[PDB]
Paper text:
Bioinformatics and structural analyses revealed that both [name] and [name] belong to PCI family of proteins, which exhibit similar sequence region characterized by a superhelical (HD) domain, followed by a conserved α/β winged helix (WH) domain. The C-terminal WH domains of [name] and [name] form a continuous surface to bind different forms of nucleic acids with micromolar affinity.
The initial complex structure of SeMet-substituted structure was solved by SAD phasing. The refined SeMet and native structural models belong to the P3221 space group, and contain single copy of [name]–[name]–[name] ternary complex in the asymmetric unit. The ternary complex in the crystal is a heterotrimer of [name], [name] and [name] with a stoichiometric ratio of 1:1:1, which is consistent with the gel filtration result. The 3D structures of native and SeMet-substituted complexes are almost identical with a root mean square deviation (RMSD) of 0.25 Å for over 739 aligned Cα atoms. A fishhook-shaped [name] fragment contacts exclusively [name]. It wraps around the right side surface area of [name] to stabilize [name] structure extensively. A unique feature is the juxtaposed arrangement of [name] and [name], which connects the two spatially adjacent β-sheets in the WH domains to form a solvent-exposed six-stranded β sheet at the top of the inverted V structure.
Author numbering:
A (entry chain A): 187 to 458
B (entry chain C): 32 to 89
C (entry chain B): 6 to 369, 378 to 423
Write the structure that this text describes.
């Protein structure tokens, strides 16, 4: 028999449960649902700290785990904390939620709302953890599950394709496919995008002897050339940004900014 | 699923291994990777479309 | 009971140890000289009673007579075998190395004991894994420097038992521990190498250990160079012996699933591809429906630089490659194919001139975009060591090295 709770106060703070549960402090789902709305209000109006929302969500999550509620409301709470966690950089609570969501999708009684969205988060997190077996074991699961509607969704295909593009260092389409990502997908990529930019920058610098600064700027989706040079200054490469004047046909001239990528080679191989 | 851990024969002599018979048997791995040309429809048409390029770019 | 007194083992002992296979009508199944009060002598005597009971169960195990569930009776057999093997561990912990292969045959059939059960909600595998972990440990740390009783020569045989258990349900953390600990141990010479281990006495475990290592290295930790090595060595130690009845290699199955990983791993690391006529490749590739066309076509597209054929071969058998743990290998091996095409436009389209226009490769901002994408794919190959060249965005060309332009390890 599952433990049932009757706490009528909407708020509750997280504590790792050491005792056998106290029904007087565990909230029933109707009260957990009334506080979901208040939390959502606060998040939407941005009148609360993420620390505060995360505490309230973990307590909401804890009250569901002791009461054995695995239904559509449960999926809603975990999907909502997962999303908010990604928005604030809390990859640890995202991953706690993501694992539980996937396990709750194994239940046939629970409808698979936003299955493809969280399939995408699973691929993107495995890209961050450098966990390619997981990506492949999940593609194989979808195939053996008969989930062809999900697999031929253009967005899902792109996300799996992105994991392959990182694997073989295709900076050109990976950065070009960064603009196709949904709101929280961008938040997840940002956890490892600096290192990925550095990995892409090494590849460029091992392969050319010099490139335009604009060409570097375009390929890395820098909104302006100032954040382009800040990114090189973050790698101790500012002195390799040289200036060379140009007269292609001896009829007009101008000066362009060059990056001596051959000079950058000596610097960037020291760090990896 | 299917057990491949259960071998049909538990042991054999060393003289009966490919490695030990490998002075009797030639290399299983062909090593002409740099110099092997193969002739098939694809290769033949690859030279075709490239001979065309050399003719227009003389 | 002279095996335990005078520290030797025979087939009769192994046949007594074999509980799955029933014994003939005349039985010699008995212990000897029973008037002992030593605690450790009753460990042997309790072991003897556990053994006779285990053997008897199989006679009644087949005779369910449609009773219904036997999961409890199966669980009876399992703790029968587990407190028996945990007791053999109590015996083998401080005995000489005579008694390690009897420990292993016991262990290996307790794996097939939990192998028959198909339900992992009630899996009793934990008992086995712990029991075998101790068995691996009892040999792994032997404090006797003299080798008469050293049990660290069976260290690798027992690792294959754990590999087998760790692969049952996908656990790539647990396999990873075992590879990394063992590597260190022989490098410090705490255990002897596999070629001078107890695995040479039973060479089935020789091939298996190189498989588990090479598979882990190639499919899980993405170390292809080492993955190729151990898988290749696993095939080089397979017996050239055939079954009389069909004339096919005795280990046809073992050889083929090694070959599934070995062939594409061999092309990626070292640019090696098989001799199809050669007895060993031909004996396996041609007699396996799965590999009979896929792999000749797969090798062909790489050698020839045929990108579409490779992509079609990978698209058509993606389920197969995914289930074999070959996705990264396939995905990385496709860029070898792209590099060979690049080599072919060098040989035949630019006259081996180290300066090559990028528009050559277009014949095989639409055009500006295709060239940007082409620079980037060449840049990644340059940066990975498939091309020794450098790019020029300005003239939209590539500049091959004057020496070693298309390197590959050998």
């Amino acid at each position: 028999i599952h433990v049932v709770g009757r706490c009528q106060t909407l708020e509750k703070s997280y504590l790792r449960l050491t005792s056998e549960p106290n029904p007087d402090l565990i909230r029933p789902p109707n009260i957990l649902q009334k506080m979901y709305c208040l939390l959502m209000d606060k998040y939407q109006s941005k009148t609360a700290t993420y620390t505060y929302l995360c505490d309230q969500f973990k307590s909401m999550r804890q009250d569901l785990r002791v009461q054995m509620i695995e239904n559509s409301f449960t999926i809603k709470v975990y999907q909502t904390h997962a999303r908010i966690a990604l928005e604030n950089g809390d990859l640890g609570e995202f991953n706690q939620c993501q694992n539980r969501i996937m396990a709750l999708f194994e239940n046939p009684t629970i409808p698979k709302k936003s299955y493809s969205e969280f399939i995408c988060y699973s691929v993107l997190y495995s890209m961050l953890t450098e966990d390619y077996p997981s990506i492949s074991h999940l593609k194989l699961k979808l195939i053996d599950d008969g989930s062809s509607e999900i697999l031929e969704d253009e967005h899902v295909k792109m996300i799996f394709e992105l994991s392959d593009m990182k694997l073989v260092g295709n900076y050109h389409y990976f950065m070009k496919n960064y603009l196709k990502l949904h709101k929280f997908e961008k938040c997840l990529i940002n956890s490892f995008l600096n290192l990925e930019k550095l990995i892409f920058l090494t590849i460029i610098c091992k392969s050319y002897n010099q490139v335009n600064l604009d060409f570097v700027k375009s390929e890395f989706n820098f909104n302006s050339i100032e954040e382009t040079t800040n990114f090189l200054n973050e790698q101790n490469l500012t002195e390799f940004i040289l200036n060379k004047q140009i007269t292609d046909s001896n009829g007009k001239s101008s000066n362009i900014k060059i990056l001596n990528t051959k000079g950058c080679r000596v610097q960037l191989i020291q760090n990896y | 699923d299917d057990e491949f851990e259960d071998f049909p024969i538990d042991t054999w002599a060393n003289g009966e291994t490919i490695k030990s018979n490998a002075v009797t048997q030639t290399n299983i791995w062909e090593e002409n990777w740099d110099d092997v040309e193969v002739d098939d429809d694809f290769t033949n048409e690859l030279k075709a479309e490239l001979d065309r390029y050399k003719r227009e770019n003389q | 009971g002279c095996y335990f007194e005078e520290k030797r083992y025979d087939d009769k002992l192994l046949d007594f140890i074999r509980y799955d296979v029933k014994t003939p009508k005349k039985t010699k199944y008995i212990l000897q000289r029973p008037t002992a009060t030593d605690e450790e002598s009753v460990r042997l005597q309790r072991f003897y009673q556990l053994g006779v009971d285990l053997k008897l169960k199989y006679s009644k195990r087949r005779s369910l007579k449609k009773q219904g569930r036997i999961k409890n009776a199966t669980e009876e057999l399992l703790r029968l075998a587990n407190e028996q093997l945990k007791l053999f561990n109590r015996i083998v912990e401080r005995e000489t190395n005579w008694i390690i292969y009897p420990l292993w045959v016991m262990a290996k059939q307790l794996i097939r004991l939990a192998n028959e059960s198909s339900e992992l909600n009630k899996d009793s595998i934990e008992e086995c894994g712990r029991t075998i972990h101790r068995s691996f440990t009892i040999c792994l740390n032997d404090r006797n420097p003299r080798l008469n009783e050293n049990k660290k020569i069976g260290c690798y045989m027992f690792a294959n038992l754990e590999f087998s258990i760790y692969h049952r349900l996908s656990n790539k953390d647990m396999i990873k521990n075992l590879v990394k600990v063992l590597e260190s141990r022989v490098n410090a010479r705490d255990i002897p190498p596999l070629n001078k281990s107890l695995a040479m006495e039973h060479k089935s475990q020789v091939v298996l250990y190189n498989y588990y290592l090479g598979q882990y290295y190639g499919c899980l930790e993405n170390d292809h160079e080492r993955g190729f090595f151990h898988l290749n060595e696993a095939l080089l130690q397979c017996p050239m012996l055939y079954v009389e009845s069909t004339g096919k290699f005795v280990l046809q199955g073992q050889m083929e699933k090694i070959m599934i990983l070995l062939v594409p791993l061999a092309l990626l690391t070292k640019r090696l591809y098989p001799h199809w006529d050669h007895p060993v490749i031909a004996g396996v590739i041609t007699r396996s429906k799965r590999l009979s066309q896929v792999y000749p076509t797969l090798v062909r597209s790489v050698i020839s630089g045929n990108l579409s054929l490779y992509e079609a071969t990978a698209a058509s058998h993606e389920r197969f490659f995914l289930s074999q743990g070959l996705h990264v290998v396939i995905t990385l091996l496709r860029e070898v194919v792209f590099t060979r095409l690049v080599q072919r436009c060098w040989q035949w389209g630019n006259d081996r001139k180290s300066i090559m226009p990028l528009k050559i490769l277009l014949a095989t901002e639409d055009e500006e975009e295709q060239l940007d994408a082409l620079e980037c794919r060449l840049a990644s190959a340059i940066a990975s060591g498939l091309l020794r060249a450098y790019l020029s965005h300005s003239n939209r060309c590539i500049v091959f090295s004057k020496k070693e332009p298309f390197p590959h390890s050998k």
